[PDB]
Amino acid sequence: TLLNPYFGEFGGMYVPQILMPALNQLEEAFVRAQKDPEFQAQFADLLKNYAGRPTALTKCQNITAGTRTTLYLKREDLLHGGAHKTNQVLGQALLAKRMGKSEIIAETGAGQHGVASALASALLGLKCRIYMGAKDVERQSPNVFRMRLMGAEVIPVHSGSATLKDACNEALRDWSGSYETAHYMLGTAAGPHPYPTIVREFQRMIGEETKAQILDKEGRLPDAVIACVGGGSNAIGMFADFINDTSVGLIGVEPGGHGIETGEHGAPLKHGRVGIYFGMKAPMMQTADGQIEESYSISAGLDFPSVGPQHAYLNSIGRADYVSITDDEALEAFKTLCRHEGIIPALESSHALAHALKMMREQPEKEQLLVVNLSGRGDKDIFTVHDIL
Amino acid sequence: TLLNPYFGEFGGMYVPQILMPALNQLEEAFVRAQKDPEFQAQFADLLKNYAGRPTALTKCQNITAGTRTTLYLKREDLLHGGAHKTNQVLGQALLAKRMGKSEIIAETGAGQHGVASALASALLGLKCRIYMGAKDVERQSPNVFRMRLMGAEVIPVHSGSATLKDACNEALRDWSGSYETAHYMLGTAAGPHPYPTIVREFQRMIGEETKAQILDKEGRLPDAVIACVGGGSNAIGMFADFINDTSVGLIGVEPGGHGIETGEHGAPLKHGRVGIYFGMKAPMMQTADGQIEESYSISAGLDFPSVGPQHAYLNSIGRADYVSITDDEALEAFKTLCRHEGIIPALESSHALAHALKMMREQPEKEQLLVVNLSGRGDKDIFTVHDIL
Amino acid sequence: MERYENLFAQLNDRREGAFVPFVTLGDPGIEQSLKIIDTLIDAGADALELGVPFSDPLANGPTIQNANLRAFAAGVTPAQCFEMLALIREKHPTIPIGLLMYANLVFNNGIDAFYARCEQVGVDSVLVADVPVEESAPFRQAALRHNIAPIFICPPNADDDLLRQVASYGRGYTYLLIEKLKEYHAAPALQGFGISSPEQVSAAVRAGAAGAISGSAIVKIIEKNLASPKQMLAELRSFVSAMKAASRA
Amino acid sequence: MERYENLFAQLNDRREGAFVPFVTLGDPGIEQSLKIIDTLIDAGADALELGVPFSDPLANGPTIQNANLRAFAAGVTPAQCFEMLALIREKHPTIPIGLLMYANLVFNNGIDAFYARCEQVGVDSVLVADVPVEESAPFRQAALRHNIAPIFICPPNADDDLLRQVASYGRGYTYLLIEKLKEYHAAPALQGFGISSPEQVSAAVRAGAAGAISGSAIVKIIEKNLASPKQMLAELRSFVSAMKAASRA
Ligand SMILES: O=P(O)(O)OC[C@@H](O)[C@@H](O)c1c[nH]c2ccccc12
Ligand SMILES: O=P(O)(O)OC[C@@H](O)[C@@H](O)c1c[nH]c2ccccc12
Ligand SMILES: *Cc1c(COP(=O)(O)O)cnc(C)c1O
Ligand SMILES: *Cc1c(COP(=O)(O)O)cnc(C)c1O
Ligand SMILES: [K+]
Ligand SMILES: [K+]
Secondary structure, X not given: OOXXXXXXXXXXXXXXXXXXXXXXXXXXHHHHHHHOHHHHHHHHHHHHHHHOOOOOEEEEOOOOOOXXXXXXXXXXXXXXXXXXXXXXXXHHHHHHHHOXXXXXXXXXXXXXXXXXXXXXXXXXXXXXXXXXXXXXXXXXXXXXXXXHHOOOEEEEEOEOXXXXXXXXXXXXXXXXXXXXXXXXXXOOOOOOOOHXXXXXXXOOHHHHHHHHHXXXXXXXXXXXXXXXXXXXXXXXXXXXXXXXXXXXXXXXEEEXXXXXXXXXXXXXXXXXXXXXXXXXXXXXOEOOOOOEOOOOOOOHHHOOOEOOHHHHHHHHOOOEEEEEEEHHHHHHHHHHHHHHHOOOEOOOHHHHHHHHHHHHHHOOOOOEEXXXXXXXXOHHHHHHHHHHO | OOOOOXXXXXXOOOOOHHXXXXXXXXXXXXXXXXXXXXXXXXXXXXXXXXXXXXXXXXXXXXXXXXXXXXXXXXXXXXXXXXXXXHHHHHHHHHHHHHOOOOEEEEEEOOOHHXXXXXXXXXXXXXXXXXXXXXXXXXXXXXXXXXXXXXXXXXEEEOEOEOOHHHHHHHHHHHHHHHOOOEEEOOOOOOOOOOHHHHHHHOOOHHHHHHHHHHHHHOOOOOOEXXXXXXXXXXXXXXXXXXXXXXXXXXXXXXXEEXXXXXXXXXXXXXXXXXXXXXXXXXXXXXXXXXXXXXXXXXXXXXXXXEOOHHHHHHHXXXXXXXXXXXXXXXXXXXXXXXXXXXXXXXXXXXXHHHXXXXXXXXXXXXXXEEEEEEOEEOHHHHHHHHHHO | OHHHHHHHHHHHHOOOOEEEEEEEOOOOOHHHHHHHHHHHHOOOOOOEEEEOOOOXXXXXXXXXXXXXXXXXXXXXXXXXXXXXXXXXXXXXXXXOEEEEEOHHHHHOOOHHHHHHXXXXXXXXXXXXXXXXXXXXXXXXXXXXXXXXXEOOEOOXXXXXXXXXXXXXXXXXXXXXXXXXXXXXXXXXXXXXXXXXXXXXXXXXXXXXXXXXXXXXXXXXXXXXXXXXXXXXXHHHHHHHHHHHHOOOO | OHHHHHHHHHHHHOOOOEEEEEEEOOOOOHHHHHHHHXXXXXXXXXXXXXXXXXXXXXXXXXXXXXXXXHHHHOOOOHHHHHHHHHHHHHHOOOOOEXXXXXXXXXXXXXXXXXXXXXXXXXXXXXXXXXXXXXXXHHHHHHHHHOOOEEOOEOOOOOOHHHHHHHHHHOOOOEEOOHHXXXXXOOOOEEEOOOOOOHHXXXXXXXXXXXXXXXXXXXXXXXXXXXXXXXXXXXXXXXXXXXXHHOOOO
16 A cells, blocks of 8 residues: 555455455545645635635634633534535545546435535536435435435445445445446545545545634634544544644544443444454444444434544544543533524534533633534434424 | 615605604614724624635536536525525624614514524524414424524414514514614515615625625626525625626516416516505505515515515616516426535525526527525425425 | 594583594494494594504504404405495594504505595594604695595604604694693694503593593404494493593583 | 365366355254255265354345345354354364354454364364455464465456465465466465356366355355245255256366
8 A cells, every 4th residue: 555554553454355456546546636736726626615615613602601611613514515524525526536437336324424425426427326224214314305306326225234334335345346437435534444544634624724713713722622423534634633733632522322331322432342344443333242233322423333543543542532422411512502602513513512511511610722623513403302302 | 864764766664653763773873883893893703703704606517518608606505504694683683782782573484584583692692582473383393493492482473364474563563662672683675774774784795705706716797696586685685786886787586486477476576566564665465455465485485575675776777687487497496406516505596596597598608607696505495395396 | 634623622612531442444344343333433432543454454463453354354345444434424424533544555556546535435534553754744745635634643752853743744633742742732632552441531631631542442342242243332332431431521 | 274175186186176155154044054054065065165144244245145134033143153163064074164254253352262263163264255465464374373274365356466465375275367376376266256057167167267156046045945944955955966066077
């Protein structure tokens, strides 16, 4: 390979031999692309004029009133599509075009990645086919329609297994024979190299903007940047630019679901064990004998059974810290943000805010400049919260 | 008054005597505010760091391929809230605070204005009570919940009459006695002066940005700017800065509903007659004997029975031109934008795009630089279109 | 114009105050409405304030808005209202008749033409609820040309300039300060703030007003006894004679 | 390791090709699976390729994935698979037994410990489907230390460097070029591209391969005759003897 596939002991390319050529092809193109000023200018134009970057950094005074905490929210919810997903999906799409490919292959759960693949493909003239499991489809019907409207071909997979990780098998199988003309669009900073690296580089603008914006507003870097961790894309996007700024705390928040002790959670990095699956070596939700388990969270966008290799690594060396937030804590942060700032956060981002609120409330007289990555909007969640309330 | 309440023969302040003091109070504050650099800086900060301005101007190449038309979309759908409504609701909120008021009174139909009033009030620490008619509530249940989440008090009005214009009566009645401490937040460039003027001034940034952006991209002003006309706010926001640029065509698009000839439409400016209601003299949907009628459109956001005074005036002198677009034409523009640019437009904005597509398709070899004001996103409409398709 | 002068002059000689009841034309039905009106008149009403059902009652709360709903359910049109007005005038030659209008029904087929129709049927005054003194010019000039009295509301938040305007523009009566109004030689003031009890009529007169107007109270009785038309009239008679007695000396 | 050498040597003396059927351990049930395996063996199978039900079959299509579902529905665990493997080895001393594994079930409780367990039960080779030659080091070194043959897949898109690697790393057989493989002295190649008819086995041998592997074809028969266990075995016997006959000289 041209780049290191591992982040310490985590990462690698654990895929069938047949798929190695596709991975090495992608890594080579990514490297060329990154050196190419024209690719960067095109990628930048799209992010600016199509997606709406740079996104704002909102100072939330109302929620931190009466405490020594100053909270800022990176407004990824204002990005075209309502979620940070668009950034890397646009980048990967330009990459497929660089490789002369005309098709895009993707798989979905929460629906957001499928819709994102669909918007990028439609915009750039790419034929997009999205795999989705029956059980998952019926639930995400609105997003299913959205994908179809955007010309995406939602392929209904149903053979016992009908979830993200279970639908990935058919997406990969396809790519195995179609990689010459098709690009598999992975939706998070996970899977086999060079995906963990590509997705981070295509999401790092979140952190680069935050740094510039925080320096503009406060004239100093934040004490900590907090982001929810589903697979790790929004989190690594925020962290990336701050890694060499040792004074800046990096906090990743995993879904605690009904509570860690209940087992019904989605926090493998801190409450799972290293395994090999999804084409990578990383911490995961698995049974005693090696069978991969499902993650749980009020928010579907955080139901990934594993975590990105770079996060597991950042944790091992003590550079980034990871914690968990319960559904109830996330629901409280959701309602609190609505009423005090008039912002409907995604249930995913609510885990990151809920933690920032905890840091504040537990130590009200602690002076701290915090930035929470508000990765998406919660318009999609109003019905869920509605039913709980 | 300090400013002219009329735009030619249209406008005025046709409200009960009791409400004149509230109107003159508001006009005076607005005038002070506009002269106040500090108010402008505060308003600007909010629009930038909270709402996400300036919004992008997207060049849509895919839809205009094979024709001599160059189309650009002003991305108001990317504004916090997903619609242009936020701009003027933020401005009016700062205005109520300037007047030392603590409450905000509003009424809703499509739900968007109620939600917008709710976000601004929550953000600025204002007690907000929103009037809504039973019939209208049940239909807009998602927005109803959104308003409650944002702390807004949705007051259920039901006494035979249960629609926007019918709910306005209770909102105004309240303001009559509460104007000392409450501000009535009108959602469009209509009603009694100084509302038509205030709303335009608080929406004019759309047009000012478009001008700068078009000059940056094309080095020339557009041949025409097109915007849908419900009450007239997004349209006047776009038009305003271009009025003195005589070479720039201004095209307002009214809802044709099932077709003008069917009578089931919402295009009073061109297919109605001047009357007096809503505190203004303006073209409206009314019976032969003066009883106000209801407008019709696939999109609820365009079901206002009248139009802003300034639009009726701009038309009379031939400065702006107004046309109509059927539900079917709007639905086609909606689907076309999704598939070719990966943008889900609001059914409201789809009327403006549908017209731009018509201008292009009818005369494919006509060279024209067009800008369509994409006033909002259509995530809210996917179910409607879903049921039709 | 004329009829008001005659009434207030007579009431003056009797040291008596005026009691004016408000009712919506055609509520709960045309036939039923004519009966209600005759009962009000012959119960003691000194003048009448009648409203024509408008699709969007801006300056109206619950009780009154419901009345319009009832009139509309009965299919009452402005055309039918003017026919009713002619009949009422044909039966009662001297009682002043005022109309509570909304700008659109007046403006619809020409302001002046509206006032001509009023004069033709024998209406004495018109109060256009949604037209402030600042927008009254074409309405008042038309009313005057047709011998109709243009009525203006003097709000509690009224100031001097308004007091002076209402004084010079209004005719017939001033829909209600009292001492200032008389200073500017305004038309006889008639208080209309929720007058629902006899004690309120006497209080209104004592304060210097020429009388009182009661609307919702009358409408309540109608809304209350819909299923019993005869009991409706009976109660309407009792209410009116009580209120009228309270203005008497 | 050992058993493969012995088999290919014998087949060589007979100018005969090897036919290796694939089946999922515990499909459609443990008891039913042992029967299927004995039937395959005594029908003519030269070697066996057995898979242990993994929760996420990456390199698997429809037929095979359904087999796992059936095994899982029967509650088949890796522990139960190794117990089955011991019994099969106890009944058939010479037939080479290969395992189709997924990296996680091998890595779970220690890679080396997995290979030790394989040697203990009498397994001869292990092909870890999701481990490319680039990540095989700890797997192959462990397999070797325990006398297990590390099997590598040689894809159609394979190039020289890969050919050379698969040649030096693989043992037992090469899961399939043929002339290059022999040039690099690779282990006897066994073609596995959808081999489902006798004509395909003879063709595979003629091309220079030492034999053919058929998986889905065997699984199809099982999936086809679930309700008829006896007809399942009967048909499995007929299919195998036909495929084996086609490798014979
Ligand atoms: O109901 P009240 O408080 O007794 O007042 C009579 C009032 O209803 C009647 O005069 C009226 C009907 N519509 C109006 C509109 C504006 C002012 C007054 C009115
Ligand atoms: O089904 P086929 O085309 O006849 O090939 C056997 C194949 O299923 C079996 O060897 C196998 C099972 N799982 C795999 C994973 C990767 C490669 C091969 C396999
Ligand atoms: C997809 C999603 C995530 C979860 O995934 P990451 O890969 O961790 O970023 C977080 N937030 C939103 C709003 C999403 O849609
Ligand atoms: C409220 C709405 C409109 C209609 O009203 P205007 O006052 O004419 O601007 C147009 N577009 C969107 C997306 C809206 O929500
Ligand atoms: K996870
Ligand atoms: K309209």
